UniProtKB/Swiss-Prot annotation, chain A:
The keyword Mitochondrion applies. Its main location: mitochondrion. The modification N6-acetyllysine is found at K286. Belongs to the class-IV pyridoxal-phosphate-dependent aminotransferase family. Substrate binds at Y137. Catalyzes the first reaction in the catabolism of the essential branched chain amino acids leucine, isoleucine, and valine. May also function as a transporter of branched chain alpha-keto acids. It catalyses: L-leucine + 2-oxoglutarate = 4-methyl-2-oxopentanoate + L-glutamate; L-isoleucine + 2-oxoglutarate = (S)-3-methyl-2-oxopentanoate + L-glutamate; L-valine + 2-oxoglutarate = 3-methyl-2-oxobutanoate + L-glutamate. This is Branched-chain-amino-acid aminotransferase, mitochondrial. Its EC number is 2.6.1.42. The lineage of its organism: Eukaryota, Metazoa, Chordata, Craniata, Vertebrata. Its cofactor is pyridoxal 5'-phosphate.
Length: 357, 360
């Protein structure tokens, strides 16, 4: 139905701007402004940019009772020329609309939201840092807001966006706990959408990981222990495959994998190089062990917006530590992926992937 | 530590809501009472509990309750008998379940008997909102949410516990319901969180419930596994009263193996039937193959869901792919259903004193 329009934006500037930072911790520091859009039985209201402020919700809000909530995560980068650019934001907009439809929340126009986000970033561009490795994290959210305890398609909703200046998350490698007792997502489920409900249950599992000397969780699937995701990151393996061919593999989008923007960007980059096989195929612990013993594994890493390419060096599997020679192999592929992404994101090389603010 | 009911502060309302009219029927979960329970937790532990005028919540925009679904809820009923005495039905079990949910989401622990007392005190304040016409009750909705103003996926250092109340009647206008049973839809899985009453389990079902409507059915029969196990009906547990394949008369409901929410009404129906000792009462997996066969052999007496909002819900039809299966629940009395409803009514409205009722 009829989406809100960036033409109808309403600006309300803060009366007292907040003092910028001077070691930015991920997701804790927020900027002066936010986008807010209300939806109800009269359709979408006018978007507005307003000072960062608390939400007022009815205590029966379906957002809080039945997890009618979804989110996105994407980054804006400030180049030398002081120009700010979003990385592949259309893909985030596409994913967000898919999430919306899955939870029966209102459809909106992807380009209208992008423009409202652009404007919001414009208003707050001084918050976008420019130091090496820094960026602005953009967190759009769409939540149901029905004031009723019936499990139902909501007739009210709020779409809002907040911004965080950020540095890194932690090229330092990580250890993973691989315990098949915990299952992140199931074929036929909603693991392939960026819905809040997929994340809350992982908190206890991440604590078990820390208590057991690991930093992230490696989510395994199926009776053949398929490697699916690392924490909130897609997983990649750079090895020589069972048929003697050097390749980059990541599991295919079969339902239990969130289709990451960085994931897709790395598959694209590597395909464009034309220097080795790039494939989407199931990866099992059985295959990984055999390859590790036969010395065919060069690099293992996770990919995601907050930690774009995360080296892995250890997997704790069936109480037995497995060493991953990632850091011993350069890590060349990882360093090469990081360099090209940096050149693109900071505008050193022009690229259609970037959207200027 | 825990908040204490001894520390309760009361703020009475200065804008009381007009209560539901005479010929104005109660719609489930839409009408709220005048007051609410509110308790905050942070690095200092739990603050003091407050009973306060029903009012909006004020949440930071990065609240982890809204980004990563750090949220759980409960649902239980208070019943007013003819002598105007209000009683809660087996609230201890909801308190137990709420605390398990909390631990699963790394949300803060609390004292079950302190929460129960705060809830009793809350209902006492709004006692006149408890209706007393037949089949009516007061639905009680506790909630516990994470409230970390941080975008990292982590254990919150701040939380919020609150409770709101609604006067209710029946969920639907003992008219049986039809169910959509399609194996494409998966509510929960072994190793997941289907056995906890966490907000994240419900949101994904809204779309599936719309497909049930679109295909002419009223609720979703959630199927699991290669063998199409019957797990749950909508937000209710499922029971089958049949003559099994070994020729024995039994009431069966799926076992608590991870994909089943352990209902209070479920447990109570098992307790009641087990206590009668008139037939076999088991927890065992139930498959579509088994149901299909039992229906063609006329061994099925009654099928029904159980849950707080619709305590004993008869089923008359199941649309399994294209096979429209008639369930003969209503032609069989429904004798067991009526018996369960009659006993529950006697216990709930205080006709017959019982250890299951907690007086307010
Ligand atoms: C967000 C996310 C990813 C990666 O997504 P990006 O779009 O690259 O940031 C991968 N797996 C899970 C489970 C995620 O939530
Ligand atoms: C709440 C619930 C039930 C039944 O719980 P009761 O405690 O009897 O009200 C059954 N199934 C699901 C999925 C539920 O959420
Ligand atoms: C989805 C936002 C987010 C939260 C969070 O705690 N993490 N942790 C990591 C390692 C990432 C990434 N990428 C991430 N991303
Ligand atoms: C959990 C509260 C609740 C919401 C809702 O939409 N429903 N629908 C039904 C049939 C029930 C029950 N029991 C129920 N219970
Ligand atoms: Cl997908
Ligand atoms: Cl009890
Ligand atoms: Cl259980």
């Amino acid at each position: 139905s009829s989406s809100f329009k960036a033409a109808d934006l309403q600006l309300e500037m803060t009366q007292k701007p907040h003092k910028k930072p001077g070691p930015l911790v991920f997701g804790k520091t927020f900027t002066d402004h936010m986008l807010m859009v209300e939806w109800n039985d009269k359709g979408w209201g006018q978007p507005r940019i307003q000072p960062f402020q608390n939400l007022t919700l009815h205590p029966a809000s379906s957002s809080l009772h039945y997890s009618l909530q979804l989110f996105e995560g994407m980054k804006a980068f400030k180049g030398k020329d002081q120009q700010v650019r979003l990385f592949r934001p259309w893909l985030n907009m596409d994913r967000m609309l898919r999430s919306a439809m899955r939870l029966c929340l209102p459809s909106f126009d992807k380009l209208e939201l992008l423009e409202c986000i652009r404007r919001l970033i414009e208003v707050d561009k001084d918050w976008v840092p420019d130091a090496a490795g820094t960026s602005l994290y953009v967190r759009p959210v769409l939540i149901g807001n029905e004031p009723s305890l019936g499990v139902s398609q909501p007739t009210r909703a709020l779409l809002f966006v907040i911004l965080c200046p950020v540095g890194a998350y932690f090229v330092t490698p990580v250890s993973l706990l691989a315990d098949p007792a915990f299952i992140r997502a199931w074929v036929g489920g909603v693991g392939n959408y960026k819905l809040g409900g997929n994340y809350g249950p992982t908190v206890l599992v991440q604590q078990e990981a820390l208590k057991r000397g690991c930093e992230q969780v490696l989510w395994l699937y199926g009776p053949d222990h398929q490697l699916t995701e690392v924490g909130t990151m897609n997983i990649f393996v750079y090895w020589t495959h069972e048929d003697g061919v050097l390749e980059l593999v990541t599991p295919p989008l079969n339902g239990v994998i969130l289709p990451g923007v960085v994931r897709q960007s790395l598959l694209d980059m590597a395909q464009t190089w034309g220097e080795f096989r790039v494939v989407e195929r199931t990866i099992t612990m059985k295959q990984l062990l055999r390859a590790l013993e036969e010395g065919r594994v060069r690099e293992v890493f996770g990919s995601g917006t907050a930690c774009q390419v995360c080296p892995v060096h250890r997997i704790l599997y069936k109480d037995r530590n497995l060493h991953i020679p990632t850091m011993e192999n350069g890590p060349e592929l990882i360093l090469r992926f990081q360099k090209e992404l940096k050149e693109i994101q900071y505008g050193i090389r022009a690229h259609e992937w970037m959207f200027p603010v």
